[PDB]
Amino acid sequence: PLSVAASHCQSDVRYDSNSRNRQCTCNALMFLAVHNESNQLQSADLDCVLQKGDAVYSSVKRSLQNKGQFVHDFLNFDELPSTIETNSRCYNIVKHPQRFGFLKDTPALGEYQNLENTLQCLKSGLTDALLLCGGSCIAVFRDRTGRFGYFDSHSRTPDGKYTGEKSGTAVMLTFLHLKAMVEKLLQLFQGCLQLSDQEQFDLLPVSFIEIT
């Protein structure tokens, strides 16, 4: 795929240890709002996503701590904010019914399918979604010109592989064919992150209502 790389990733030391490397669900949500405003994001736009997403995480964490509802580190879909601000715009978040499945397994239950077949919903069924699997969250999308892609706020090489080197950055990867993106996502989840065939993934389609 084609790649746009940020200059850094969410574990960068510029983020306070309070939020460092815990912001991915917020970064994925912020990405989908910014990408909806403009598909052709530049590297500096992804940097801005990481900055605003970290700020959102810190605000939500503070809110739940004042309410005594903070125990774990990565915010789940239930703890995501209901409103989000980009550069100049503000949106209410519409959470749609979640989809669940397994990376490769397809239990005889029948209802839940594997990742490849579940993500077929991106052809028309929906355009923007958060994808959580094995404690890692990414954003997946179908863009205005019918391309498929995802945004990964973790430490990645330009081609989307995990790296522990300080050269790793967040990346957005864009594909002409959905099948190519599915293969890449399986390389990420099962190759780089070593997640097993029976690992469950959680898909949250989101839409945005502009409130200026």
Residue numbers in the entry: 0, 300 to 321, 601, 323 to 510
Paper text:
Deubiquitinating enzymes (DUBs) cleave peptide- and isopeptide-bonds downstream of ubiquitin. By performing a comprehensive bioinformatical screen, followed by biochemical and structural characterization of interesting candidates, we were able to identify active members of this family in a wide range of eukaryotic species and a few host-associated bacteria. Due to the similarity to the herpesvirus proteins, we refer to this extended enzyme family as VTD (for Viral Tegument-like Deubiquitinases). While some VTD activities resemble viral tegument DUBs in that they favor K48-linked ubiquitin chains, other members are highly specific for K6- or K63-linked ubiquitin chains.
To further elucidate the structural basis for VTD activity, we solved the crystal structure of DrT1-VTD2 (residues 300 to 520 of Uniprot entry A0A2R8QBC4) at a resolution of 1.90 Å and compared it to the ubiquitin complex of mouse cytomegalovirus M48, the only available structure of a herpesviral tegument deubiquitinase. The asymmetric unit contained one DrT1-VTD2 domain, which was completely resolved with the exception of residues 107 to 109 located in a protruding loop where Leu108 and Gly109 have rather weak density. In total, the structure contains four α-helices and nine β-strands, which adopt the form of an α-β-α sandwich, in which a bifurcated antiparallel β-sheet is flanked by α-helices. In VTDs, the catalytic histidine and aspartate residues form an invariable Asp-x-His motif, while in typical DUBs the catalytic Asp/Asn residue follows the His residue at a variable distance. As a consequence, the catalytic histidine (His453 in DrT1-VTD2 and His158 in M48) resides on the opposite site of the catalytic triad, creating a mirror image to the classic papain fold active site. To confirm the predicted role of Cys322, Asp451 and His453 as the catalytic triad of DrT1-VTD2, these residues were mutated to alanine and tested for their catalytic activity. Ubiquitin-AMC assays as well as incubation of K48-linked di-ubiquitin chains with C322A, D451A or H453A mutants demonstrated a complete loss of activity. When the DrT1-VTD2 residues 403–411 were replaced by a short Gly-Gly-Ser linker, the enzymatic activity against Ub-AMC and di-ubiquitin was completely lost. However, the quadruple mutant DrT1-VTD24mut (F398A, P405A, A406G and L407A) completely lost its activity against di-ubiquitin, suggesting a complex multi-factorial recognition of the ubiquitin Ile44 patch. Individual mutations of both residues (D376A and E377A) resulted in a strongly reduced chain cleaving activity, and also a reduced cleavage of Ub-AMC, the latter effect being more pronounced for E377A.
